Design an enzyme around this catalytic site. Structure first.
Site, PDB file in Angstrom:
ATOM      1  N   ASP A   1       0.731 -14.903   7.126  1.00  0.00           N
ATOM      2  CA  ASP A   1       1.527 -14.714   5.914  1.00  0.00           C
ATOM      3  C   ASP A   1       2.991 -15.028   6.209  1.00  0.00           C
ATOM      4  O   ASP A   1       3.896 -14.241   5.913  1.00  0.00           O
ATOM      5  CB  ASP A   1       1.360 -13.300   5.350  1.00  0.00           C
ATOM      6  CG  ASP A   1       1.701 -13.221   3.878  1.00  0.00           C
ATOM      7  OD1 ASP A   1       1.802 -14.286   3.247  1.00  0.00           O
ATOM      8  OD2 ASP A   1       1.855 -12.095   3.343  1.00  0.00           O
TER       9      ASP A   1
ATOM     10  N   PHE B   1       0.793  -1.235   0.000  1.00  0.00           N
ATOM     11  CA  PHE B   1       0.000   0.000   0.000  1.00  0.00           C
ATOM     12  C   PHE B   1       0.824   1.284   0.000  1.00  0.00           C
ATOM     13  O   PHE B   1       0.289   2.360  -0.292  1.00  0.00           O
ATOM     14  CB  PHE B   1      -0.966   0.048   1.189  1.00  0.00           C
ATOM     15  CG  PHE B   1      -1.656  -1.248   1.466  1.00  0.00           C
ATOM     16  CD1 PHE B   1      -1.461  -1.902   2.671  1.00  0.00           C
ATOM     17  CD2 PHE B   1      -2.493  -1.820   0.526  1.00  0.00           C
ATOM     18  CE1 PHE B   1      -2.102  -3.116   2.942  1.00  0.00           C
ATOM     19  CE2 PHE B   1      -3.132  -3.034   0.788  1.00  0.00           C
ATOM     20  CZ  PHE B   1      -2.935  -3.679   1.999  1.00  0.00           C
TER      21      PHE B   1
ATOM     22  N   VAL C   1       8.121   2.757   1.828  1.00  0.00           N
ATOM     23  CA  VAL C   1       8.672   2.529   3.153  1.00  0.00           C
ATOM     24  C   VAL C   1      10.058   3.152   3.217  1.00  0.00           C
ATOM     25  O   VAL C   1      10.847   3.034   2.271  1.00  0.00           O
ATOM     26  CB  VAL C   1       8.710   1.022   3.479  1.00  0.00           C
ATOM     27  CG1 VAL C   1       9.169   0.798   4.916  1.00  0.00           C
ATOM     28  CG2 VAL C   1       7.321   0.408   3.232  1.00  0.00           C
TER      29      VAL C   1
ATOM     30  N   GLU D   1       9.549  -0.548  14.180  1.00  0.00           N
ATOM     31  CA  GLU D   1      10.940  -0.917  14.375  1.00  0.00           C
ATOM     32  C   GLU D   1      11.624  -1.111  13.026  1.00  0.00           C
ATOM     33  O   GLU D   1      11.041  -1.658  12.096  1.00  0.00           O
ATOM     34  CB  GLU D   1      10.977  -2.214  15.205  1.00  0.00           C
ATOM     35  CG  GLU D   1      12.343  -2.838  15.420  1.00  0.00           C
ATOM     36  CD  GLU D   1      12.252  -4.118  16.257  1.00  0.00           C
ATOM     37  OE1 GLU D   1      11.113  -4.580  16.528  1.00  0.00           O
ATOM     38  OE2 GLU D   1      13.308  -4.654  16.634  1.00  0.00           O
TER      39      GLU D   1
HETATM   40  C1  LIG Z   1      -0.523  -2.037   6.052  1.00  0.00           C
HETATM   41  C2  LIG Z   1       0.268  -2.013   7.329  1.00  0.00           C
HETATM   42  C3  LIG Z   1      -0.356  -1.878   8.570  1.00  0.00           C
HETATM   43  C4  LIG Z   1       0.423  -1.792   9.708  1.00  0.00           C
HETATM   44  C5  LIG Z   1       1.800  -1.846   9.591  1.00  0.00           C
HETATM   45  C6  LIG Z   1       2.359  -2.005   8.326  1.00  0.00           C
HETATM   46  C7  LIG Z   1       3.828  -2.132   8.127  1.00  0.00           C
HETATM   47  C8  LIG Z   1       4.392  -3.325   7.682  1.00  0.00           C
HETATM   48  C9  LIG Z   1       5.754  -3.436   7.463  1.00  0.00           C
HETATM   49  C10 LIG Z   1       6.604  -2.351   7.677  1.00  0.00           C
HETATM   50  C11 LIG Z   1       8.048  -2.481   7.338  1.00  0.00           C
HETATM   51  C12 LIG Z   1       9.020  -2.444   8.284  1.00  0.00           C
HETATM   52  C13 LIG Z   1      10.419  -2.656   7.960  1.00  0.00           C
HETATM   53  C14 LIG Z   1      11.506  -2.666   8.845  1.00  0.00           C
HETATM   54  N1  LIG Z   1      12.774  -2.891   8.451  1.00  0.00           N
HETATM   55  C15 LIG Z   1      12.952  -3.113   7.137  1.00  0.00           C
HETATM   56  N2  LIG Z   1      14.230  -3.167   6.677  1.00  0.00           N
HETATM   57  C16 LIG Z   1      14.886  -4.346   6.117  1.00  0.00           C
HETATM   58  C17 LIG Z   1      14.037  -4.987   5.032  1.00  0.00           C
HETATM   59  O1  LIG Z   1      14.731  -5.127   3.804  1.00  0.00           O
HETATM   60  C18 LIG Z   1      16.249  -3.906   5.595  1.00  0.00           C
HETATM   61  O2  LIG Z   1      16.133  -2.754   4.777  1.00  0.00           O
HETATM   62  N3  LIG Z   1      11.994  -3.156   6.203  1.00  0.00           N
HETATM   63  C19 LIG Z   1      10.749  -2.914   6.623  1.00  0.00           C
HETATM   64  N4  LIG Z   1       9.757  -2.937   5.667  1.00  0.00           N
HETATM   65  C20 LIG Z   1      10.115  -3.233   4.278  1.00  0.00           C
HETATM   66  C21 LIG Z   1      10.275  -4.727   4.017  1.00  0.00           C
HETATM   67  C22 LIG Z   1       8.968  -5.510   4.094  1.00  0.00           C
HETATM   68  C23 LIG Z   1       9.148  -6.965   3.685  1.00  0.00           C
HETATM   69  N5  LIG Z   1       7.861  -7.661   3.523  1.00  0.00           N
HETATM   70  C24 LIG Z   1       8.411  -2.722   5.939  1.00  0.00           C
HETATM   71  O3  LIG Z   1       7.607  -2.734   5.006  1.00  0.00           O
HETATM   72  C25 LIG Z   1       6.040  -1.165   8.138  1.00  0.00           C
HETATM   73 CL1  LIG Z   1       7.038   0.232   8.412  1.00  0.00          CL
HETATM   74  C26 LIG Z   1       4.678  -1.048   8.362  1.00  0.00           C
HETATM   75  N6  LIG Z   1       1.608  -2.087   7.205  1.00  0.00           N
END
Ligand SMILES: Cc1cccc(-c2ccc(-c3cc4cnc(NC(CO)CO)nc4n(CCCCN)c3=O)c(Cl)c2)n1
Ligand SMILES: Cc1cccc(-c2ccc(-c3cc4cnc(NC(CO)CO)nc4n(CCCCN)c3=O)c(Cl)c2)n1
Lengths: 264, 262
Positions: B131, B22, B25, B87
């Site tokens: 998931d 959605f 990030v 986080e």
């Molecule tokens: C719809 C909804 C509702 C409530 C919460 C979320 C949500 C879910 C995941 C994250 C999130 C948090 C996050 C934290 N650290 C990292 N770094 C890693 C990943 O590659 C190194 O850079 N990536 C993150 N990635 C990217 C990788 C996702 C892999 N499936 C994120 O997307 C975040 Cl910030 C929020 N979404």
């Protein structure tokens, strides 16, 4: 090398694979894990002079830790017999894959890309494989590609500066890769119809080989880039991973399973 | 969800780490606490009709308090933009770690053990991740392993009863598919159209791990991938599996795999 443990108790010897270098090689089982291993058995009462070469390849293999280099698990001394335990790759060698007809360019690019990843690892670690050729490129049953059978520190794959017994470095492997590219495309290295002693003087004396036939121009340019008489003009493995032939044709390694199956 | 404070003041975006579900990030900093965070920004006009799914995932993350689940810090709504603060994990996902080469069984067991600790926490709290897959398992710079991106209430990781309509045992099945993914690089039926896989998972015998893997790893996969959900073990049971006990190591061991990825 472990001298106390009985390798006949740790391992189950199954089918002989072939007449390897200095010994026989067997498919085996690790009794503790049930993983299949490759077991080379060398009679040390019989191969006296070659012992130093054996030790050096053990040392180099033991210093490698890469998914593109066949893993060395250890070695055991039982009476006069040295058992060397290696990772087993069930898909055969790249040479085995050439026996019926031709590889297509997708197959060639996929195989070359993985060999390049192994060479990039080795060169970044200040190592030189020294015997890159299709017979020393091993495939798992699922298409993973790994380097085996390092050369000692037949001339068809040797770089000109190696043949002339000059100093050499990682660029020698890049030349051998170029010959191996021709081998994967034609089934045999250049000059394979000539006696090895004639090829001995031909390689330093002649223009470098080129890939002849109906091949895409990038595959020809890849070969040309590798087969430069001047070693410092050959690109690194890291740069060759970005060559147009590789980027345009290489696919997931799991697609080689079709080709592997067709030979098993 | 904060409507008063301005998130473009409270947070400094450092770099876009990628597109998420959605929204984009970012790696950023909370300027007040001076700690790195992950920031997802969702445009609620562009993402309408996914809003309930967004809300459901915020609710379930907000109820988790475990070192094995990515912490949820809060959310901010500026104009039509929802900022979700979580986080940050600096080591990539498990799927990323599959990039620079095959994972060996020590790596696989260490990652699976940590995932199982997360599942044990969730299942004991009467939650279901929904998931589990390598893409949703994130690693810190130091090898810590955490669950992210919960499913809400692509089929390759789905249990047969989820397809046919479940409980925590669905996560155990997905864990088994994820074990195959860590060992082979991709889940079973990776090459097939998702609509084919939709009928194949209920119809076919469960997948097995094929190849030259140790017998315990194959047994771990088989234990997870039972077509009957009630015959799959708990996460707590699987933490004692021979495969986990014989191969898992301290999480710090993964730092070399993470460094090779950079
Ligand atoms: C719809 C909804 C509702 C409530 C919460 C979320 C949500 C879910 C995941 C994250 C999130 C948090 C996050 C934290 N650290 C990292 N770094 C890693 C990943 O590659 C190194 O850079 N990536 C993150 N990635 C990217 C990788 C996702 C892999 N499936 C994120 O997307 C975040 Cl910030 C929020 N979404
Ligand atoms: C003197 C010395 C010193 C240190 C190590 C070695 C050494 C090097 C290669 C292997 C080895 C390992 C190995 C692993 N798998 C397979 N399966 C393939 C065979 O094509 C499929 O059955 N064959 C293997 N073949 C046979 C094919 C060799 C082709 N060049 C092997 O020989 C082994 Cl077991 C040991 N030798």
């Amino acid at each position: 090398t472990n001298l106390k443990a009985d390798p006949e108790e740790l391992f189950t010897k199954l089918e002989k694979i072939g007449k390897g270098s200095f010994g026989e090689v067997f498919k085996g089982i690790d009794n503790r894990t049930q993983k299949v291993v490759a077991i080379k058995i060398i009679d040390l009462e019989e191969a006296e002079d070659e012992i130093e070469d054996i030790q050096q390849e053990i040392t180099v293999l033991s210093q490698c830790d890469s998914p593109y280099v066949t893993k060395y698990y250890g070695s055991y001394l039982k009476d006069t017999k040295l058992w060397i335990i290696m990772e087993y790759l069930g898909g055969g060698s790249a040479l085995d894959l050439l026996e019926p007809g031709p590889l297509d360019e997708t197959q060639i690019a996929t195989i070359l890309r993985e060999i390049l990843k192994g060479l990039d690892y080795l060169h970044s670690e200040k190592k030189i494989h020294r015997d890159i050729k299709a017979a020393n490129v091993l495939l798992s049953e699922h298409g993973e590609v790994k380097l085996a059978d390092f050369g000692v520190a037949t001339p068809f794959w040797m770089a000109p500066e190696v043949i002339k017994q000059s100093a050499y470095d990682s660029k020698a492997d890049i030349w051998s890769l170029g010959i191996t590219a021709i081998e994967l495309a034609r089934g045999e290295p250049p000059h394979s119809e000539l006696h090895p002693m004639k090829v001995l003087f031909l390689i330093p004396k002649n223009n470098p080989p080129t890939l002849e036939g109906n091949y895409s121009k990038p595959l020809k340019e890849f070969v040309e880039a590798c087969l430069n008489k001047e070693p410092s003009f050959r690109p690194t493995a890291k740069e060759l991973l970005k060559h147009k032939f590789i980027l345009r044709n290489a696919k997931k390694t799991s697609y080689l399973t079709e080709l592997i199956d067709a030979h098993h």
